[PDB]
Amino acid sequence: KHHPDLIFCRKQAGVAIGRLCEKCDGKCVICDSYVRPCTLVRICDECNYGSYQGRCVICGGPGVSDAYYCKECTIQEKDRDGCPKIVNL
Amino acid sequence: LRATVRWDYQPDICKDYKETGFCGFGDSCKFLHDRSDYKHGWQIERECFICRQSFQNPVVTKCRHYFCESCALQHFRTTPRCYVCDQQTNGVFNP
Amino acid sequence: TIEKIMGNLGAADIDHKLEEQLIDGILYAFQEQTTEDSVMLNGFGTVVNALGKRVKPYLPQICGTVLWRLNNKSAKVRQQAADLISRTAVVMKTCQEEKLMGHLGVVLYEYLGEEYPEVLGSILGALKAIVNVIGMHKMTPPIKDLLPRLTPILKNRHEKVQENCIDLVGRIADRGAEYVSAREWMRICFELLELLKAHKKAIRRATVNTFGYIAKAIGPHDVLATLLNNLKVQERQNRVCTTVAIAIVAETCSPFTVLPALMNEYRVPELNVQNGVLKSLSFLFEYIGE
Amino acid sequence: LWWSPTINRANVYVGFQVQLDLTGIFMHGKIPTLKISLIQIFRAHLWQKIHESIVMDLCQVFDQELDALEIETVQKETIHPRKSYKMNSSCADILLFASYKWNVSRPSLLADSKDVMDSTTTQKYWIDIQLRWGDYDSHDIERYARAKFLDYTTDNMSIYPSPTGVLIAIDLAYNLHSAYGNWFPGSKPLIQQAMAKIMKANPALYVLRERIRKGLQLYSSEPLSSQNYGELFSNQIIWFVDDTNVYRVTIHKTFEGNLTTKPINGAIFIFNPRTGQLFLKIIHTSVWAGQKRLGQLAKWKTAEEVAALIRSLPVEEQPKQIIVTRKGMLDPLEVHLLDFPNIVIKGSELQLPFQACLKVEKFGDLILKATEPQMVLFNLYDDWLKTISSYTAFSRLILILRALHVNNDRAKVILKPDKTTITEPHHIWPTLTDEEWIKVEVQLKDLILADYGKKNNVNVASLTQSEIRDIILGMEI
Amino acid sequence: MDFQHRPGGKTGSGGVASSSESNRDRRERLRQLALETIDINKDPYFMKNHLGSYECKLCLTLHNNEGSYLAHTKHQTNLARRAA
Ligand SMILES: [Zn+2]
Ligand SMILES: [Zn+2]
Ligand SMILES: [Zn+2]
Ligand SMILES: [Zn+2]
Ligand SMILES: [Zn+2]
C-alpha cells in the first residue's frame, strides 16, 4: 500500500506526539498494516509546531486519533528510525 | 360467549420477500413486501454423600468433592485416593 | 461558549428553572439551524450529557419536537433530527426510560423505508446508537424482525447508507447473533460479497469484520467455501479483501479448521486463486503472530 | 389509500360485508390494493395495541385521581385479546368500585353541559372503549356512540356488571372521539380532558399516524405599526383574548394575623381595537374556587363561554383574527375553538395591558357586585373614538391601559384632572373634547414616559418618536 | 391488471447476475469456444500450463487470452523452423 516516493523526515524524534485523521485511521505509519498498535508515534520537530498542529502524519487531513506503530515494525524496532510524517518532495 | 368474526382469509404476502428478502418482480409485486412471523387472526382464534448423614465444617478436597471435615479426614486416613472418581487426591485433607 | 463552560466545569450548579431555560434555549437553537452546525450538535450532546439524569422531565418535550421535525419537507431537517437522536440515545438510556426509547425505535423502524440516502444513513446511525445503548433483549422491535428489514438495505449503492448499515449489522452479529437463523446469515454473506466491491476502505474493513463475526457465530465452513468461490470467481480490482476476510475468519475460528480447504484450493490451476491462497496465508500469519 | 373513506363506503349497491384481519375495518367486496395498504398499515396487532394503550392510559388517569371522586378501586378487565375486533358485542373494559353511593344521572352525550344528575344512585361503574374505522358516509361519532350504547345495554349478549356506565367511541380514520352513557359527578370534565390528552399524545396512536403518513408519503413543510397595534384597522378584525383575569381573588383579612381569600368573580377580556369594545365575560362566585384544575378547567369554561359568545355573534360580528398574547393556558382554548375558527390566534409584536382592563369604575362595579355570568360589554374609547381614527383611538386606549398599569393616580390625574371629565355610565374613559382628549393623551404619555424612565433608570424624553408610539400602542420598545 | 401481458417472471428466481459473474461466464464460454475450435482444427501446438496458461509449443509462446492464441495462426515460419 506504499509508494516509492515520499521520504519522511529522517530526523531525530522528540516529545511531540503523532496524530491521525479518520480517512486513514488505524493504519501503521510504516508498513500500513492494522495489527497490534503497540508503540506511539513521535514526530520530531516543526512537523507539529506552527500551522501543522494536530494534523495527519499521513495524507494531510485534520487528525483525530493518536498514530501508532504496529508490533511487526517494532519487532526490528523500526520506530526509532525517525519521524514518519510525510513530506511531499 | 361466542365472538366469531368473518375474516378475509387471503393473506397476500410475498413468499419470496418473506423468506429471502428479495423478490423477482420488484416494485411490480402483486402482494405486499413484509418480513414478519406474526400469527394471523384465524390462527389466533383457532388456538458424607454416601452414608446420607449430616455435614459439619464442609471442605472440598483435591478431587473436587465437598464433604465434612471429619469425613474427609477419615477418607484421607483410610485411603490415599478419593472415592468419587478414583482421582489422585493423595489423601489431602485441606479446606 | 455554553458547551465549553459545561465541558470545563459541569452541570452541578444548574438550578431547576435554569435547566428548563437551558432546555428551551437549546430546543429553539436546534429549531432555527439554517446551516450545517455540527459543532452546535456536539454542543447539544455535551450539554445533555453533562445534565445526565436531570433531563428526565424534559425528555418527552425533546422527543416530541424531534418526532415533529422528522415529518418535514426538507431532507436536511430529517437528517438533523436523526442525528439528534443518535447524539441523545446515550443520555436517554442513562435514566433507563426504555418505553420512550423503544417507541423511538419503533418510529425509526417505520422510517427505515426512506428513499433519501443521507436521511437513511442518519436513521441507520441512530438505530445503531439505540441498539448499542439498550441491548438486544429489551430492543423493541426485536432483532428477528429488525435484521430481515436490514437485509434489502445492504443492496443500496450509496456510501453512507452502506457504511451505517454494515456497522449496524456488525454490531448485531458481534453482540446479538443468537436470534437469526443461519440461512439469513448466509444470505447476508452473499450480499457482503457484492458489498466488497465498494470504494471506501472503511466499508471493506467493516465488511471483513462482519465476515469474521458471522463465521464466529454460525461456523467457519460454508462461509469459507463461499469466500473461496468468490476468490476463484472475481478476477477484478477487488478480492484481496476476500483474502483478508479469509484470514480474519481463520484467525477468529481456530485456523486448523480452515487450512485443509485453503491448502486444497492451491491445486486449482485457474491462475489467480493460488495468489489469493498465498495472500490469505500471509495475512493469516500477520494476524495470528506467535 | 388517500381516498379510502370514499372508496370503502358502507352504503353500496351490493356487497358482502367482511371484516379485515386483526382490525375492525369492514370491506364490502374484494378490493385488493386497498386491502394491501390497510393490512400494511395495521400489521403486528396495531388495533389491539392501540386499544390496550388507551385502556392503560385511562387506568393511569383514574389511578392518579382515585381519591378525588370517592373511588375505592380501579380494575383492569383482564380479558380475551379478541375483544377489540368484535363489533357485534362488547364486554366492559374498566371497572370502578366507589367508596359511597354515587349519584348517577340518566345517559347523555359527553358534550351535554346540562345534566340534572339525581336520576338514580349506585356504587359500581364500568367504562367501555370502542374503536371504529369510519368512512365518508358514517364519520359521525356521537350517533354511533349512543346507538352502540343502546344496542349494548339493551341486548343480553353484551355483559356489563352494572346497569350504569359509559361507552367511549374513537374513530381512528377521522381522529374523532365521543362518549355516551351515565355520569357520576366530577367525571365528565375529567374524561373530557383525559380523552383530549390521550388523542393528543398517545404513543400507539402516534405509531398509527406515522404509518399512515409514510403510506401516503406526505410531509409538513410548515414547522402605526406592522404589529397587532395597527393591524386591527387594516381591514381585519383582531380581537385580543385574555383569560389571565379568570383566576382572580380579592384581598381580605381576618381578626388574627392570618388572611383569607375572597372568591371574586373571574373575568375574560375580549378587546377590539378597531371599535374600542371591551367584553368582560363574568363568572360566578362559586366557580372561581373549589373545583379542580383551576388553571385548566376554569380556562376551559372561559373558552366555552368565548365560543358561545362567538357563536351567538354574527359572521361579521365574529373577528377575522385574534391578537393573542403568549400562550400559557391557550391549549384548551385552541382545542375548544373548532366551532369558531374565523379568528386566528397568534402572538404578534404588540401586546395589550389587560390587567388594567378591570380599571374602569362601571365595569369593576358590574363585575364585583355580581354572582352570575352576566358577560357584560363596555366601550374603552366611547367619546375619544369620534375625535380620532381607529388606530389612533386604539393607541390612545392602549396608552391609557399602560398608564393605568403603571400608576393609577397619575393615570386618573391625566385622564380626569377635574370634575368636568365625568362621562356617561357606559363610558370607561373620561369625558373630553377633541383637544381635551389630545391633551389627556399627551399627559398620559408624559406620565407613562416618566414611569418608564423611573423603572428603567433612563430619561423620559430619550426615546425616539417611533419607540414612544410603540410603547403607547403596547408594542415592543 | 393485464396479468397475461405483464413481462414474464417466475418465483424463486434469484435475479440477474452482476458484471463480475457475467464477465467470468463470458470468459469461460470464450475458453470453451477456443477449445472447441482447437479440437476442430486438431492443432497439437496448444498446451495448458500448470498455472493454467495457453502455450504454443511450435512457437514456444505464452498467451494471456484465448484470442491471443487464436490470432497465433509468425506461426508458419516458426513451424517450418521447428520442423527440422
Ligand atoms: Zn490521513
Ligand atoms: Zn508496521
Ligand atoms: Zn518530522
Ligand atoms: Zn414480492
Ligand atoms: Zn505458433
A38 is in an annotated binding site: no
Nearest-CA neighbor of C63 among C46, C50, C48?
Answer: C48
Place of cell 372521539: D177
DSSP state of D321: B
Read off the C-alpha cell for D445.
404619555
Contact yes or no for B38 and D44 at CB 8 A: yes
Side by side, which strands form the sheet with E61-63? E46-48, E54-56, E61-63
Residue D322, exposed/middle/buried by CB under 10 A (0-12, 13-18, 19+)?
A: buried
Identify whether the C-beta of residue D356 lies closer than 8 Å to the C-beta of residue D405: yes
Work out the number of other CB atoms within 10 angstroms of the CB of residue D7. Answer: 14
Residues of E in contact with B24 (CB under 8 A): 9-15
Cis ω for the linkage preceding C141 (within 30 of 0): yes
What is the C-alpha separation between C79 and C98, in angstroms, rounded?
Answer: 23
Q: Cα-flanking dihedrals φ and ψ of residue D241, to 5°?
A: -110, 125
What is the C-alpha separation between C175 and C147, in angstroms, rounded?
Answer: 13
Contact yes or no for C152 and B22 at CB 8 A: yes
Identify whether the C-beta of residue D238 lies closer than 8 Å to the C-beta of residue D352: no
Instruction: Tell me which residues have their CB within 5 A of the ion that is ligand 3.
Output: A 9, 44, 47, 83, 85
Contact yes or no for A35 and C205 at CB 8 A: no
Which chain D residues touch B if contact means CB-CB below 8 Å? Answer: 17-22, 27, 30, 32, 35-36, 39-40, 43-45, 80-83, 85-86, 88-89
DSSP state of B7: B
Identify whether the C-beta of residue C186 lies closer than 8 Å to the C-beta of residue C222: yes
List the alpha helices (DSSP H) in chain B. 15-18, 41-46, 69-78
Residues of C in contact with D211 (CB under 8 A): 110
Which chain E residues touch C if contact means CB-CB below 8 Å? Answer: 18, 20-21, 23-24, 27, 48-53
Read off the C-alpha cell for C82.
436523526
Read off the C-alpha cell for D476.
415592543
Beta-carbon contacts of residue C243 (< 8 Å; ≥ 6 apart): C231, C276, C277, C279, C280, C283
Nearest-CA neighbor of D376 among D368, D387, D384, D386?
Answer: D368
Q: How many angstroms separate the Cα of A53 from the Cα of each of A49, D425, E53?
A: 6, 81, 54
What is the C-alpha separation between C282 and A16, in angstroms, rounded?
Answer: 34
DSSP state of B32: B
Q: How far is the CA of D107 from the centre of ligand 2 (A)?
A: 84
Adjacent-strand bridge partners of C72 = D220
Identify whether the C-beta of residue B4 lies closer than 8 Å to the C-beta of residue B13: no
Strand ranges (DSSP E) for E1-84?
46-48, 54-56, 61-63
Identify whether the C-beta of residue E56 lies closer than 8 Å to the C-beta of residue E79: no
Q: How many angstroms separate the Cα of E20 from the Cα of each of C193, C197, C237, E17?
A: 11, 10, 11, 8
Does A59 contact chain C (CB < 8 Å)?
no
What is the C-alpha separation between D145 and D169, in angstroms, rounded?
Answer: 6
A47 is in an annotated binding site: yes
What is the C-alpha separation between E24 and C270, in angstroms, rounded?
Answer: 12
Question: How many residue contacts between C and E have a Cβ separation below 8 Å?
Answer: 23
DSSP state of D358: T
Q: What is the identity of the amino acid at D137?
A: D
Three-point CA angle D290, D294, D299, nearest 5° = 130
Nearest-CA neighbor of D201 among C103, C94, C101, C102?
Answer: C103
Cα dihedral sign, C191-C193-C198-C203:
positive
Identify whether the C-beta of residue C251 lies closer than 8 Å to the C-beta of residue C282: no
Instruction: Nearest by CB to C187, from B21, B36, B37: name it.
Output: B21
Beta pairing, strands D322-324 & D345-347: parallel
Cα dihedral sign, D99-D105-D110-D112:
negative
Beta pairing, strands D261-262 & D322-324: unpaired
Does D78 contact chain C (CB < 8 Å)?
no
Nearest-CA neighbor of C85 among C70, C75, C71, C99?
Answer: C70
- C272-286: string of b/e by CB count within 10 Å (b at 16+)? bbbebbebbbebbeb
Contact yes or no for E27 and C235 at CB 8 A: yes
Cα dihedral sign, D72-D74-D79-D84:
positive
Q: What is the identity of the amino acid at A57?
A: V
D44: left (phi over 0), alpha (psi -120 to 50) or beta: left
Q: How far is CA B61 from the centre of its chain?
A: 30
Residues in chain D: 477
What is the C-alpha separation between D250 and D257, in angstroms, rounded?
Answer: 17
Q: How far is the CA of E11 from the centre of ligand 3 (A)?
A: 63
Place of cell 419536537: C65
SS3 D240: strand
What is the C-alpha separation between D250 and C210, in angstroms, rounded?
Answer: 73
Identify whether the C-beta of residue D101 lies closer than 8 Å to the C-beta of residue D162: no
Beta pairing, strands D250-251 & D261-262: antiparallel
Work out the number of other CB atoms within 10 angstroms of the CB of residue C159. Answer: 15
What is the C-alpha separation between D292 and C146, in angstroms, rounded?
Answer: 46
What is the C-alpha separation between C93 and C85, in angstroms, rounded?
Answer: 12
End-to-end alpha-carbon separation of chain D, Å? 52
* Ligand closest to the CA atom of residue A65: 1
Adjacent-strand bridge partners of D474 = none
Q: How far is the CA of A45 from the centre of ligand 1 (A)?
A: 19
Residue A52, exposed/middle/buried by CB under 10 A (0-12, 13-18, 19+)?
A: middle
D376: left (phi over 0), alpha (psi -120 to 50) or beta: beta
This structure's resolution (Å) is 3.1
What is the C-alpha separation between B61 and B77, in angstroms, rounded?
Answer: 13
What is the C-alpha separation between D462 and D454, in angstroms, rounded?
Answer: 12
Residues in chain B: 95
- Chains contacting B with at least 3 CB pairs below 8 Å? C, D, E
Strand ranges (DSSP E) for chain A?
37-40, 68-70
Place of cell 465488511: C207
Nearest-CA neighbor of C197 among C259, C167, C240?
Answer: C240
Read off the C-alpha cell for C271.
491462475
What is the C-alpha separation between A84 and A78, in angstroms, rounded?
Answer: 10
Contact yes or no for B16 and E15 at CB 8 A: no
Task: Compute and round to an integer the Cα radius of gyration of chain A.
Answer: 12
What is the C-alpha separation between D12 and C285, in angstroms, rounded?
Answer: 76
What is the C-alpha separation between D231 and E28, in angstroms, rounded?
Answer: 82
What is the C-alpha separation between C149 and C159, in angstroms, rounded?
Answer: 19
Question: How many residue contacts between B and D have a Cβ separation below 8 Å?
Answer: 49
SS3 D18: strand
Residues in chain C: 290
Nearest-CA neighbor of D21 among D44, D5, D3?
Answer: D44
What is the C-alpha separation between D358 and D381, in angstroms, rounded?
Answer: 14
What is the C-alpha separation between A24 and A32, in angstroms, rounded?
Answer: 9
* Ligand closest to the CA atom of residue A33: 2
Element containing residue C155 per DSSP (H, E): none
Instruction: Tell me which residues have their CB within 5 A of the ion that is ligand 1.
Output: A 21, 24, 56, 58-59, 61
Adjacent-strand bridge partners of D278 = D271, D378
What is the C-alpha separation between C106 and D145, in angstroms, rounded?
Answer: 32
Work out the number of other CB atoms within 10 angstroms of the CB of residue D145. Answer: 25
Read off the C-alpha cell for C215.
463465521
Q: How many angstroms separate the Cα of D385 from the Cα of each of D119, D243, D412?
A: 54, 26, 19
Beta-carbon contacts of residue E61 (< 8 Å; ≥ 6 apart): E55, E72
Read off the C-alpha cell for D18.
367482511
Complete DSSP assignment for D177-211: EEEEE---TTHHHHHHHHHHHHHHH-HHHHHHHHH
Contact yes or no for B36 and C145 at CB 8 A: yes
What is the C-alpha separation between C73 and D173, in angstroms, rounded?
Answer: 24
What is the C-alpha separation between C136 and C102, in angstroms, rounded?
Answer: 12
Q: Do chains A and D touch (3 or more CB pairs under 8 A)?
A: no
Contact yes or no for E6 and B28 at CB 8 A: yes
DSSP state of C113: G
Read off the C-alpha cell for E25.
461466464
Residue B63, exposed/middle/buried by CB under 10 A (0-12, 13-18, 19+)?
A: middle
Q: What is the identity of the amino acid at D315?
A: V
Read off the C-alpha cell for D442.
399627551
Q: How far is CA C241 from the centre of its chain?
A: 20
Residue D450, exposed/middle/buried by CB under 10 A (0-12, 13-18, 19+)?
A: middle
Identify whether the C-beta of residue D190 lies closer than 8 Å to the C-beta of residue D65: yes
Q: How far is CA D276 from the centre of its chain?
A: 25
Work out the number of other CB atoms within 10 angstroms of the CB of residue B24. Answer: 18
Read off the C-alpha cell for C105.
425505535
Q: How far is the CA of D209 from the centre of ligand 1 (A)?
A: 46
Does E77 contact chain B (CB < 8 Å)?
no
Q: How far is the CA of A44 from the centre of ligand 3 (A)?
A: 5
Instruction: Nearest by CB to B6, from D19, D22, D43: name it.
Output: D19
Q: How far is the CA of B23 from the centre of ligand 4 (A)?
A: 4
Q: How many angstroms separate the Cα of B36 from the Cα of each of C135, C153, D271?
A: 21, 16, 59
Nearest-CA neighbor of A54 among A87, A83, A21?
Answer: A21
Q: How many angstroms separate the Cα of A12 from the Cα of each of A82, A86, C204, C246?
A: 5, 15, 36, 40
Contact yes or no for E48 and C270 at CB 8 A: no
Beta-carbon contacts of residue C55 (< 8 Å; ≥ 6 apart): C19, C23, C48, C62, C91, C95
Residue C130, exposed/middle/buried by CB under 10 A (0-12, 13-18, 19+)?
A: buried
SS3 D419: helix
Give the mutation candidate from C61, C67, C73, C78 for the D interface (greatest D CB count, under 10 A). C73
What is the C-alpha separation between D348 and C241, in angstroms, rounded?
Answer: 63
Work out the number of other CB atoms within 10 angstroms of the CB of residue D12. Answer: 11
What is the C-alpha separation between D8 and C21, in angstroms, rounded?
Answer: 49
- Helix%, strand%, coil% for chain D, nearest 5: 35, 15, 45
Residues in chain A: 89
Nearest-CA neighbor of B91 among B65, B70, B61, B66?
Answer: B61
Residues of C in contact with E53 (CB under 8 A): 271
Q: Do chains E and A touch (3 or more CB pairs under 8 A)?
A: no
What is the C-alpha separation between D184 and D107, in angstroms, rounded?
Answer: 10
Cα dihedral sign, D116-D118-D119-D122:
positive
* Ligand closest to the CA atom of residue A79: 2
Q: How many angstroms separate the Cα of D47 from the Cα of each of D44, D422, E12?
A: 9, 69, 33
Nearest-CA neighbor of B67 among B89, B40, B41?
Answer: B89
Identify whether the C-beta of residue C86 lies closer than 8 Å to the C-beta of residue C38: no
What is the C-alpha separation between E42 and E30, in angstroms, rounded?
Answer: 18
Identify whether the C-beta of residue A69 lies closer than 8 Å to the C-beta of residue A27: no
Q: What is the identity of the amino acid at E2?
A: D
Place of cell 399512515: D212
Beta-carbon contacts of residue E9 (< 8 Å; ≥ 6 apart): B24, B25
Strand ranges (DSSP E) for D222-297?
240-242, 250-251, 261-262, 267-272, 277-282
Q: What is the identity of the amino acid at C51?
A: L
* Ligand closest to the CA atom of residue E43: 5
Work out the number of other CB atoms within 10 angstroms of the CB of residue D292. Answer: 14
Q: How far is the CA of E69 from the centre of ligand 5 (A)?
A: 8
Work out the number of other CB atoms within 10 angstroms of the CB of residue B94. Answer: 10
Read off the C-alpha cell for C154.
445492504
Longest CA pairwise span in chain D (Å): 85
A31 is in an annotated binding site: yes
